[PDB]
Design an enzyme around this catalytic site. Structure first.
Site, PDB file in Angstrom:
ATOM      1  N   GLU A   1       0.793  -1.225   0.000  1.00 46.60           N
ATOM      2  CA  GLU A   1       0.000   0.000   0.000  1.00 46.60           C
ATOM      3  C   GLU A   1       0.832   1.285   0.000  1.00 46.60           C
ATOM      4  O   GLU A   1       0.387   2.329   0.483  1.00 46.60           O
ATOM      5  CB  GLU A   1      -0.980  -0.029   1.181  1.00 46.60           C
TER       6      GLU A   1
ATOM      7  N   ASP B   1      -0.372  -5.846   9.510  1.00 49.20           N
ATOM      8  CA  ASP B   1      -1.412  -4.985  10.050  1.00 49.20           C
ATOM      9  C   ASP B   1      -1.535  -5.408  11.510  1.00 49.20           C
ATOM     10  O   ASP B   1      -1.425  -6.595  11.822  1.00 49.20           O
ATOM     11  CB  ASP B   1      -2.782  -5.246   9.400  1.00 49.20           C
TER      12      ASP B   1
ATOM     13  N   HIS C   1      -0.301  -0.328  10.616  1.00 52.09           N
ATOM     14  CA  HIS C   1       0.805  -1.183  10.189  1.00 52.09           C
ATOM     15  C   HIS C   1       1.999  -1.186  11.132  1.00 52.09           C
ATOM     16  O   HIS C   1       2.196  -0.263  11.919  1.00 52.09           O
ATOM     17  CB  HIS C   1       1.308  -0.742   8.810  1.00 52.09           C
TER      18      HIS C   1
HETATM   19 MN   LIG Z   1      -2.726  -3.223   5.464  1.00 50.66          MN
END
Ligand SMILES: [Mn+2]
Ligand SMILES: [Mn+2]
Ligand SMILES: [Mn+2]
Ligand SMILES: [Mn+2]
Ligand SMILES: [Mn+2]
Ligand SMILES: [Mn+2]
Lengths: 589, 589, 589
Positions: free
Chosen positions: A341, A365, A531
């Protein structure tokens, strides 16, 4: 040594043997002892500090002992010429403070004063550190607790620990300078960490920022701008080693066999293209793509993915998984720190751990806090041992280095090792413990394959996260702890109701009964982003040292106070409250 | 709801249900769950948070779930026109951080992430909070400790506590904006808190500053600028319910019978005039005083009194006593926060507690610290129970809300309740437990009547004080504790040698063994002014949350660390030393 | 009025008629005069200030004159619910300064004091401005130079000019709040202005930042995510009105006839997609793309283009050209401010000029400075008239609003008018004066069509550019001047050796003999970026006022000092050196 992937040479550590300038007596009696002290440090570092490719760090010793400004200037000249990025001063005697100081404000520096009685070595240490503090040039002080006899070339354990911690943190800091962070795509789903703050990279890390829109991948895939020979070998390797697990998409969300085959082809090409973008590829020159062959000299990069790319093309799960791993179709190799991401802050969090350990870092995460009460209610099971006070589910949205399986082994214990220490069995086991699952089309319409594994328990780890806060700037949080094993039946229940096609790591942070480490809940409630980066081992002390060099305060950590090692100047801002002193020192200096 | 006393409507709370923007699957399956969450929060707040008039707080829910900027903008628009002054985001899934953020920097905001496993709700919570922190928009994070199953409409206890604390503090902050502080008179006897610093009211509280010289009371009294019908009713009510105690003035210091009658007449008129200045009076318009009828839209005011006014006219004891009370000749009503000696900082201290509880606040002088040794020496009595380690004498210079008697009862316990919960018995007993004493003419040459009562012991209370310090600005101190009872024989001795015609409250602060709470002496020695505000109950946690919203650091408090609830950004400035982090966050943010 | 494109209603202007609070004489004799003043201002503004859709700005007048805080609070309340974003106070008499002030710090404010002798109107003006200055609430002061008789309803010319300039600038500022800047793609070819600094948008403009990778255009094109009915109509319109000029690519650089057709198809789809991303499209919802139908509520956007997109797909020339124009296949319409190369700072530069004029803005490269000597050497021609001292070649990399042709006419003069004033003739001529040229494949490998036209000379214009400088923040530069005509023979020579397939505007800045305006060379040498925005007319004074409201210093401009109109507070920071005072006021306030 030449850096095998990036422009220039790997940073060297310069050793500065300082000495009393008085001749016809003092200096002559100390020449050999002082130079030997310098040689002892070089030997120690060469045997304990290694570059990311496994080569021992290289040290440069001044041509003469430094007893005055002329000799100090020559050392500065030699070090600049040989590419020194870290400096360590050593001496067993009194030396003339400012006349012998390393005035380079751009390199991490430490001073080791021999704890001997015959000459004022500890006096020089304190005297020169007072100079460094007065001049605003942070420097670490190293002083052994037990008096050693003159000329003792055997470095005591407490001194060894400080020399190594400093050298590793200094090398990591030196490694980032001049390199790029490559942003592939833009902000991903409004994630704060995917916004690039150039000031941070430039001013704190000495890094450059490069940018490439994801449409570049479309062009290279369509025009075949990648090594086709390698591609075929890679595709074959994937077919032979990457096991495809059950498709969890239910009718209406299941992709066809044809689509799934293309998902693999594109996923592999994405991996090649991403790598080519980061470090270049000379093969592209003979292919007529000279500009593309250059690369962006990036030691870290990120891929936006969602929502624009994944709404149509295969996701970056495999690419993000393989690049961060310590091996692929070309054999064992150093990982390519790649952020999911395009979360550049997590990318840097991963980079810190990587440069300090040379081991693959796990992107994840901070998904769920499972209290004993909740686990009991949902599974009827009572958490035991390390997990008795609750656990934290660390699981990235589909990508994670295969090293995260914890299948790599040393002395019969689960670990993550630098690629140069991997055995063929370590690699095979990592692959055998992993399943690639068709991407969940409700989230990833374009398809792809997620990484499914379960990290073995009992492994010491450290999770960390860098955040940028308005009115403060960069700030680092750390949490050392261990991975844990849950009964198979228990894990299955917690896993199925979360995201069973993604990679799972069960984490328990070490508690301190204070700060944000009073209980497991507090550790997660205080995490500053969704994160985190996971590294094998307890590297919190190393991270703290590295952070102080970068002037990045540590807002949260569970590292024993006795292990905190920061520049001498930090103590001048407070000795009772090290946290407050850290903030004060980072801002003022 | 229209504000019954001030311009405009009471602040509303806006609820923002955020959701994953992905359709054709994800969003559709979460629409109901997410909106229901928003409805559950609205329900909880309407049943636990009330405006100062007893009306339940009103909530505004976005017209649609918020999955992107377009919907976020619509919510912002609706809220702005609906008069929302506090916002709460809720969600059980992943949402696109910055795309869904509330960007209004002028309203307190919280985010509640459902602790469910099916969707990344806690991941959104952390991700968006990182966004708020990175953008400099303070926001509170609410995360439950126990995993709830998908669809659970129940709100856990830990979540409820945070939602309510935030809502109450947010509402209190929203209430002050746009309102005035009315300064009647100027500085009183060199008291620092009676100096008005407009920057504080304007920049920290969003309030306006109004001024009126005390000569205004002379004009209104002489010209009969007040409701004469009410005046006559009030006089009869006072003579019937306010019993006059013994006159303590010695021979050449007592006022004539005629003077004592006029003292009552004037004292009642002063109360009418003060109230009329604060909120206006339509009656004045009918009388031909249209400008005066408007009022100063003041939610808090102060009366200088000494030395100028009291050197000639009846003092403001009765006025200050009755206005701050929850009842008068017109029946039960909301108090009018009114500061003795025009100490605007104590007035705000009182206002904070009032807006958080809707209960009358007690103005008091931190008069004396009585050590066990001192009490023993003077009375021969050994302090017991809670008072065993010493007591603090809280007693204002003649004025105090009658609620301070502690005669109001709930479940057989002494309390101070919102006026809308008062029983005729409560009011009756408050009046019975009070004696009005002729003012000491050596201090108050114009006469007047002081309030003499003794607060019932065993009642939990919180004293607080706001101070303005050069080089820092506003700073708040808090001390939770209890009122205590002393043997009547002991009380009489201590009371007689102090000021028996004034109101007494015996206070014992909760000790922590650290900071300014190691012993009772330390609590007093560390108090920053001669005045404090007393509120019923332990509201330190509520005050801390309110202070953080206002960016006012708390230099001293005895609230358990587990109860401290501040914006997520505060932790970024330190987790080990919350006090230092508080100062850093307030300054930098 | 509802905003036809964005969420919410268009900003309203609130008028605050203040008056002396004294009744029984003074106030009664001024009620009508004061309220009439407010009505006169509302009338003037409705006839001279218009929203971007041509609708006259709407004003809200307080319900009563404001003689004290109560009425001031009522006005604040009404304005907040009415959606007022700009406020103007008016009065012909003395009013009670701070009691009557507008304390909203988030809205531009002006005060007009009637220059009458009967009552101290100018005294109130100065007194309240002192209040605004002392409280840090910037406010503009408007005082007419000629005494008017009591009751005169006419507004002097000097007063009208200030009221209108303030209203226009205030409206422009209010318009941006809450809106988004949409970044399509990332940084383009290392252009600093294509780096998005969220702090600027958030803190200076009150705007939101949205992001979309260019791969989104691939998905929407491939999947037909756009209005297909409109697409077909648009294609026919283009083929019929957009004439294709000669192809300048040499032999091995021309695209096939088939490719050129697809280039047009894609170019049109790109325009539809870009517009749909900016403001949404209900058509998409009916098609089953509900999330896409919402849009990003963007009042300005940018498209990266090079290098990633253009290395493979048709460039964004046509898209950037048509969106910025005041008309297309759907008829005349307001422009969509769209930045070439995702240069968000030029996009804002354009937005400023647009919101102040409602006219299309021209994006341009400050390509070349042609000295008289250079022109003479290359053409043998001696520059004459306005161009006698040199000219500057303004020409974007292929895109420019068709309004830039200067074919639109008013009173026989070339201009650019708001779309709502366009005649079919204007539109027709703009199209006739333009040729669309096949893109240069050595730069744009994917093809496309550039805009080729020559701006008619003699038109007054203003170029401007916003830059962000480390250690300063945003800073604006302005250069008023005119477009000029060159003999066709001369234009051809200079044009051919530059970039003949791109749009040309020959610019001559007004010189002042000082600063960066001593000569034409200095104007170019002092420009802070390679891009600028061109607006029809001399709007430097308007930009200066707008900049002061935004607290953005103006480092360079050639506006006559007598026309500089900034908040009264600016003069407190210096009257001799207005530039230095501007920097001081922007920094300290
Ligand atoms: Mn993530
Ligand atoms: Mn598994
Ligand atoms: Mn007092
Ligand atoms: Mn008593
Ligand atoms: Mn350009
Ligand atoms: Mn031409």
């Amino acid at each position: 040594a030449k850096d095998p992937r990036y422009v220039g040479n790997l940073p060297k550590i310069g050793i500065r043997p300082t000495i009393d300038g008085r001749r016809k007596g003092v200096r002559e009696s100390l020449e050999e002892t002082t130079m030997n002290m310098a040689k002892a440090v070089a030997k120690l570092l060469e045997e304990n500090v290694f570059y990311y490719n496994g080569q021992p760090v290289e040290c440069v010793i001044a041509d003469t002992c430094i007893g005055g400004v002329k000799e100090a200037a020559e050392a500065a000249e030699k070090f600049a010429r040989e590419g020194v990025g870290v400096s360590i001063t050593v001496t067993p005697c009194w030396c003339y403070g400012t006349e012998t100081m390393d005035m380079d404000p751009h390199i991490p520096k430490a001073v080791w004063g021999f704890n001997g009685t015959e000459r004022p070595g500890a006096v020089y240490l304190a005297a020169v550190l007072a100079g460094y503090n007065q001049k605003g040039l942070p420097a670490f002080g190293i002083y052994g607790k037990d008096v050693q006899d003159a000329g003792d070339t055997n470095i005591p354990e407490d001194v060894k620990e400080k020399l190594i911690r400093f050298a590793k943190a200094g090398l990591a800091v030196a490694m980032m300078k001049g390199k790029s962070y490559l942003s592939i795509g833009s902000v991903s789903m409004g994630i704060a960490g995917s916004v690039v703050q150039e000031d941070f990279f430039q001013n704190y890390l000495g890094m450059r920022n490069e940018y490439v829109d994801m449409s570049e991948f479309v062009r290279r895939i369509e025009l075949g701008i990648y090594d086709k020979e390698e591609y075929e070998r890679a595709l074959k390797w994937v077919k032979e080693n990457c096991k495809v697990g059950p498709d969890n998409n239910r009718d209406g969300f299941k992709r066809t066999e044809e689509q799934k085959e293309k998902d693999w082809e594109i996923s592999v090409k994405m991996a090649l293209i991403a790598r080519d973008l980061m470090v270049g590829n000379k093969k592209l020159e003979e292919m007529g793509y000279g500009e593309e062959a250059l690369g962006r000299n990036a030691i870290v990069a990120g891929f936006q993915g969602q929502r624009q790319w994944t709404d149509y093309f295969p996701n970056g799960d495999f690419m993000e998984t393989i690049l961060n791993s310590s091996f692929d179709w070309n054999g064992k190799r150093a990982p390519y720190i790649f952020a999911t991401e395009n979360d550049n802050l997590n990318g840097i969090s991963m980079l810190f751990g990587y440069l300090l350990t040379n081991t693959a870092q796990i992107f994840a995460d901070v998904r769920t806090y499972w209290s004993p009460e909740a686990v009991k209610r949902v599974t009827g099971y009572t958490l035991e041992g390390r997990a008795a006070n609750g656990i934290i589910h660390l699981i990235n949205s589909g990508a994670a280095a295969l090293d995260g399986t914890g299948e790599q082994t040393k002395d019969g214990k689960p670990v993550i090792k630098p690629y140069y220490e991997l055995t063929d069995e370590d690699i095979k086991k990592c692959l055998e413990a992993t399943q690639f699952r068709p991407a969940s089309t409700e989230y990833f319409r374009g398809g792809g394959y997620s990484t499914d594994f379960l990290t073995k328990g009992g492994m010491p780890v450290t999770i960390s996260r860098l955040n940028i806060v308005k009115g403060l700037g960069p700030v680092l949080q750390i949490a050392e702890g261990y991975t844990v094993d849950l009964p198979e039946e228990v894990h299955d229940v917690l896993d199925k109701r979360t995201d069973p096609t993604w990679p799972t790591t069960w984490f328990v942070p070490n508690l301190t009964g204070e700060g944000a480490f009073k209980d497991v809940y507090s550790v997660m409630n205080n995490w500053g982003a969704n994160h985190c980066s996971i590294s094998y081992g307890h590297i919190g002390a190393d991270l703290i040292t590295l952070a102080s060099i970068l002037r990045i305060p540590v807002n949260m950590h569970n590292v024993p106070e006795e292990k905190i090692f920061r520049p001498d100047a930090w103590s001048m801002f407070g000795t009772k409250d090290l946290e407050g002193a850290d903030y004060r020192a980072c801002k003022k200096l």
